[PDB]
Design a protein around this ligand. Structure first.
Ligand SMILES: [Cl-]
Length: 164
């Protein structure tokens, strides 16, 4: 198990424009297109991202290309952010993937707002971090995904993603 397989479990794969859990236009493996309510705006973003006239459908290879770019960007976002980088550097490899998962879902700014949870992670108070992370809109809106990520921070294993 690695970060690509993990996010593929959490995000799924769809080759046509769809709305995500928040109602936003999305394609591929959780690639957000736009927060605008206009499908035309979303189709224009898609064509710009892919570089051809797609008419709202992409291939699996195109979806995997956007996915590689998005994972790369999440990592680079962590390492550039002064609040996230010291956390990431303090973590083992499994828990690093859990942090990347959160940044992929909610962005660098969103995760950098979990101030108290990040401090607990850095101190390696895993049970206390797990409790604090669950006191969040994130946990209440997407509880099955949040549980899996939180379990990964608590245990430092992939057990939440096996049998899936
Ligand atoms: Cl969920």
């Amino acid at each position: 198990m690695n970060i690509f397989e993990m996010l593929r479990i959490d995000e799924g794969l769809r080759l046509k424009i769809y709305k995500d859990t928040e109602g936003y236009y999305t394609i591929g493996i959780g690639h957000l297109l736009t927060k605008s309510p206009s499908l035309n705006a979303a189709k224009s973003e898609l064509d710009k991202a892919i570089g051809r006239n797609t008419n709202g459908v992409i291939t699996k290879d195109e979806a995997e290309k956007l996915f590689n770019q998005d994972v790369d960007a999440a990592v680079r976002g962590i390492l550039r952010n002064a609040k996230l980088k010291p956390v990431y550097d303090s973590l083992d490899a499994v828990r690093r993937a859990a942090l990347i998962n959160m940044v992929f879902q909610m962005g660098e700014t969103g995760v950098a707002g979990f101030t108290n949870s990040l401090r607990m992670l850095q101190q390696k108070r895993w049970d206390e971090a797990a409790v604090n992370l669950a006191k969040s809109r994130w946990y209440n809106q997407t509880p099955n995904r949040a549980k899996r990520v939180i379990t990964t921070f608590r245990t430092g294993t992939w057990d939440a993603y096996k049998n899936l």
